[PDB]
């Protein structure tokens, strides 16, 4: 028994031979029997699947699933599905891509829809979430770790890294969603996600499972969703930019003109996923750059500043 507890050796013939060397007067075969219930309980443990407790994990998963030409520009549609374990409810949304900021936005949306947070969140291996896993030393990130601590949950990405017991269910739910929804709202992916949310509220979260026979919404209601902090960890890209001695800097191919005090110093641009840029310098907030949909050349910006100073 201690041999199995410590060394996990469920080999019956070997243990019988060992104890025979130790002075055993019994028979190999009854020890084979005895070690069977042991290894059979071990195989029961091996087959142990779906150990989801109420409010334990929301089964996060990402995948590129679509392609659209939004505004005449090709873009790859990326879908996020968080399945709430025990309840079996799932929040699904496909918006832009697999960037970390959109990941956090989707997690916040799922928490708001579920009205709370679970104990932990289980992800899938990818570029985001974790930069790199080295022999169990999983260094996820700094900002992501702060976000997880802020909301309360913790990353526990340890799914099976094979097509068995992870890929099977993932593709199952993926194509189940694809076939049942198969919606096409409009060229704009935002409207597509709007109709997706309607479909999820109508015939996805209220679709009883054949085995349980109860809509997952009831289990979700009875699950433990601890209240979320009621505020959202910032979902804006943070990026530093140096200002040339011209009082100018650059961001995503557009060049901005600052004032004299800001020339030659490092500002921090914060861009919400909404699409508004805010310039924070030395902790404080500086004047907005009146961002416009139409791109204006640096020459026009210089002319505008000249006229303004006039």
């Amino acid at each position: 028994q201690k041999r199995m507890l410590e060394d996990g050796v469920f080999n019956s013939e070997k243990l019988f031979f060992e104890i025979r060397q130790q002075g055993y007067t019994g028979g190999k075969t009854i020890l084979k029997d005895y070690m069977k219930p042991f290894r059979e309980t071990a195989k029961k443990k091996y087959t142990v699947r779906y150990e989801t407790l109420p409010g334990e994990q929301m089964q996060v998963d990402w995948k590129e699933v679509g392609e659209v030409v939004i505004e005449g520009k090709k873009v790859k549609l990326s879908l996020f599905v968080a399945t709430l374990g025990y309840s079996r409810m799932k929040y699904a949304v496909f918006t832009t891509s697999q960037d970390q900021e959109h990941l956090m936005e989707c997690l916040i949306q799922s928490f708001k829809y579920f009205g709370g947070v679970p104990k932990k969140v289980l992800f899938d291996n990818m570029k985001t979430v974790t930069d790199g896993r080295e022999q169990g030393v999983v260094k996820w990130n700094q900002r992501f770790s702060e976000f997880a601590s802020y909301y309360g949950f913790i990353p526990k990405v340890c799914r099976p890294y094979r097509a068995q017991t992870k890929g099977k269910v993932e593709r199952a739910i993926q194509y189940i969603m694809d076939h049942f929804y198969v919606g096409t709202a409009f060229e704009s992916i935002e409207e597509l996600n709007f109709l997706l949310h309607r479909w999820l509220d109508q015939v996805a979260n209220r679709k009883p499972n054949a085995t349980t026979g109860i809509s997952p919404q009831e289990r979700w209601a009875e699950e433990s969703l601890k209240p979320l902090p009621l505020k959202d960890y910032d979902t804006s890209y943070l990026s530093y930019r140096k200002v040339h001695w011209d009082g100018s800097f650059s961001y995503k191919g557009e060049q901005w003109l600052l004032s004299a005090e800001y020339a030659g110093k490092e500002i921090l641009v914060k861009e919400r996923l909404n699409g508004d840029i805010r310039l924070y310098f030395r902790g404080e907030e500086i004047s907005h750059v009146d961002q416009q949909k139409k791109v204006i050349s640096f020459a026009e910006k210089i002319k505008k500043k000249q006229t303004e100073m006039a």
Binding site: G8, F10, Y46, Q135, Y161
Partner: protein
Amino acid sequence: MITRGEFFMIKEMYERGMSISDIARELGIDRKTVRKYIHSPNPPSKSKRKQRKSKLDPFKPYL
């Protein structure tokens, strides 16, 4: 290409007396791969490849 830690774990658990097949199951590795690594000197996690041809090779002397 099991990493240093993976090879250390395989060798240690095998020498402890644990069966090899369930070792492979636990570490998510093929049984043949694990058995081959049982009788191996040190963790293999490096592959050496030499340079290869590029597009700017013919122009390189001129540049």
